[PDB]
């Protein structure tokens, strides 16, 4: 059982990049990336072979470039794959895999407002078995994978 | 079971670009893809080989250029795919895909207005299967996919 | 049962530069990476073969060039991976693993401001089992991994 939570949070704003590059070229099994570039993002990764939670409450968002990036990436890969890139705020971000309950809230917040880039560059090229890909570019998206075999 | 929702949230405006260049392009079993460009969009994948809900309740939206695109993608692909692009401020995406339960509910909301593009460059060239693809550009709308073999 | 708790704290801003060459690149079992170039970071590894906690209350974060990046590493592994990279000023980070509870929350903060680089290079390229990747760039992101296997 994981949670992730975020009570109030005043944020006033700058370069925010991240980004991968020729990386997860080959896989097998499980696979899980998230990428984001913000201020209050949330990341979580679960994966099985053989209950879960997010909230983000109240945050005070108040302003900058935003980059998030993925060059050339999980090309050749056997089983699943999740990725999710975000170029926000408040973005949050989950992946459940598994071989052989999930949860993700955003409440009350205040987005005020600026270049936000997402992307997603050659990748996921030939991906045999489960792929799931989510791109935003925003304040508060939220991202979500759900794979399986067997 | 998944879920994701959004409880009030104030969203004022602004770049917002999110896109995928050539990615994808080769698949087996199972593939989905979302892009959005936005304010609180909602993104979930579910595939799997061999009861989710997605609630967007009373959120202020008031205000920008948003950009959600993709270039080539999803090519030669085998098995089931599915694609959601959108360029609005509270729209919501979802794929559902099998190999041998689903709602989504907007409430309340505040849309006040600005330029929207949405966007499919050359992709879904050669699929084989099953495909989908919803692109749409506002500032609530609601997509989703289910796709299935066996 | 382990604990990381950050009360109070007034940072007032400089180069955070933290990385990782060609490293970690073969494995057997479980692994787990944690960088992060910023003020307040929290990281924690977990793992196991055959109730944690992360606070982070009120800090007032005030301001630099953060860069935080992973080059080769994490290339053919068998088992289970987790790598989390942020670079921003109060992030936290946690990896679970397993073979054969969780909670991490963020209280009041107070983020003012600089430019931020998160990054992965060439790396997890030929992953065996399970692995999970997660990236940010940003002020306050929060990153979690679990696998298991058996």
Same mark, same amino acid.
């Given at each position: 059982? @994981?949670?992730?939570?975020?009570? =109030? *949070?005043?944020? =006033?704003?700058?370069?925010?990049?991240? &980004?991968?590059?020729?990386?997860?070229?080959?896989?097998?099994?499980?696979?899980?990336?998230?990428?984001? %570039? &913000?201020?209050?993002? !949330?990341? =979580?990764?679960?994966?099985?072979?053989? =209950?879960?939670?997010?909230?983000?409450? @109240? /945050?005070?968002?108040? +302003?900058?470039? *935003?980059?998030?990036?993925?060059?050339?990436?999980?090309?050749?890969?056997?089983?699943?794959?999740?990725?999710?890139?975000?170029?926000?705020? &408040?973005? !949050?971000?989950?992946? +459940? $895999?598994?071989?052989? /309950?999930?949860?993700?809230?955003?409440? @009350?917040?205040?987005?005020? *407002?600026?270049?936000?880039? %997402? &992307? $997603?560059? /050659?990748?996921?090229?030939?991906?045999?078995?489960?792929?799931?890909?989510?791109?935003? %570019?925003?304040?508060?998206? !939220?991202?979500?994978?759900?794979?399986?075999?067997?």
């Amino acid at each position: 059982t @994981d949670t992730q939570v975020s009570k =109030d *949070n005043k944020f =006033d704003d700058t370069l925010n990049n991240a &980004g991968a590059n020729g990386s997860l070229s080959n896989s097998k099994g499980n696979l899980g990336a998230n990428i984001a %570039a &913000g201020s209050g993002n !949330q990341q =979580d990764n679960a994966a099985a072979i053989t =209950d879960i939670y997010q909230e983000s409450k @109240d /945050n005070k968002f108040t +302003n900058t470039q *935003n980059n998030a990036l993925l060059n050339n990436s999980a090309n050749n890969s056997s089983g699943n794959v999740g990725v999710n890139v975000a170029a926000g705020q &408040g973005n !949050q971000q989950k992946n +459940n $895999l598994a071989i052989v /309950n999930t949860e993700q809230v955003s409440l @009350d917040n205040h987005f005020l *407002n600026v270049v936000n880039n %997402a &992307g $997603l560059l /050659n990748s996921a090229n030939n991906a045999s078995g489960n792929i799931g890909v989510n791109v935003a %570019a925003g304040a508060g998206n !939220q991202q979500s994978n759900t794979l399986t075999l067997g």
